[PDB]
């Protein structure tokens, strides 16, 4: 076989699909947004998670077309159900580094925003802190244009990589996402308490929103809310779900 060929074939057959993981307010309430996560519905193997295929997709140069197809599918999925979403509903996408050197991301974003009434949603792009994006005049231009569209920038897996304050102002960062490994250590390791608290400290100093990822227990939720964490995500809040389950739950919240 050829795994590159097989990714191309999967893309042509629309086998990459969105799952939706909800975000809720630190102090509780109805969902204020979703993170969109790629799944591969494989004809044989079933539903495959992205750690099994995204790195190959990056090596092969296919991640950008796969991301575009996801964003288009989200527009067709949630575009006609805006009234189920309270205003300011966040929709987040993980963006690969190569996509951030490409001015076509601006068009991908404008197209997704065009599928909802104006200002109804807030589109969030998540860039992992692990690979820190090298700046150029192209990235300066791209991020100015995204900002002017109303797109927000979140730095994902925060606390695991090595970014600086100066880099946070460069790319106009709106939000830090606390890596789930730090959240897993709450009520256990003392070191990570100081790390977590230092992430919270930085977000206050810079006036940034903060999402904790990986909130699995009530003890985690309560520790994080006592520290002002804006938004919570994790299995306690809701596992990544297909559209049908997302719509179900949004109808209940009303
Ligand atoms: N580039 C990229 N990464 C994704 C996408 N969906 C999920 N990931 C990443 O894959 C990893 C595993 O996610 P889960 O198995 O849903 C996470 O770090 C997540 O951010 C996507 O559409 N694009
Ligand atoms: N074990 C575990 N994984 C989670 C939890 N919440 C989200 N995930 C997974 O973490 C990944 C999201 O990571 P990113 O922050 O890198 O997008 C997805 O694969 C998602 O399914 C959680 O509470 N526990
Ligand atoms: Mn993410
Ligand atoms: Na990520």
Numbering used by the authors: 5 to 258
Please share text taken word for word from the publication where this structure appeared:
We were fortuitous to observe PA3825EAL with bound product pGpG, from co-crystallisation with c-di-GMP and Mn2+. In this complex, the M1 site in the pGpG-bound structure is superimposable to the M1 metal in Mg2+ and Ca2+ complexes, the M2 site is vacant, but we observed a solvent binding site that interacts directly with the bound pGpG that presents metal like coordination geometry. We propose this as a potential third metal binding site, designated as M3. Diffraction data collected above the manganese absorption edge confirmed the presence of Mn2+ in the M1 position in the pGpG/Mn2+ PA3825EAL complex but showed no signal for manganese at the M3 metal like centre. Consistent with the absence of any anomalous signal in the M3 site, we have placed and refined sodium in this location which is abundant in the crystallisation condition and consistent with the geometry observed. The M3 metal site displays a tetrahedral coordination sphere consisting of Asp 160, a water molecule, the ribose O2′ oxygen and a P1 hydroxyl oxygen from pGpG. In PA3825EAL, the M2 site is empty, but Glu217 (contributed by the β7-α7 loop in close vicinity to the β5-α5 loop) replaces interactions with the phosphate moiety normally made by M2. While PA3825EAL lacks a metal in the M2 site and possesses one in the M3 site, the comparison with CC3396EAL, in which all three metal sites are occupied, suggests M3 site is a bona fide metal binding site in PA3825EAL. Instead, the M3 metal is observed in the product state where it is ideally poised to stabilise the negatively charged transition state during hydrolysis of c-di-GMP to pGpG; where pGpG directly contributes to formation of the M3 metal site via its non-bridging phosphate oxygen (terminal phosphate group of pGpG). The data presented also allows the identification of a third metal site M3 which is a hallmark of the product state.
DGC domains containing the signature GGDEF motif synthesise c-di-GMP from two GTP molecules while EAL1516 and HD-GYP171819 domain-containing PDEs are responsible for the hydrolysis of c-di-GMP to 5′-phosphoguanylyl-(3′-5′)-guanosine (pGpG). Hydrolysis of c-di-GMP by EAL domains has been shown to require the presence of divalent ions, either Mg2+ or Mn2+, with the most efficient reactions occurring at alkaline pH2933. Here we report as yet structurally uncharacterised EAL domains from the core genome of Pseudomonas aeruginosa, PA1727 (MucR) and PA3825.
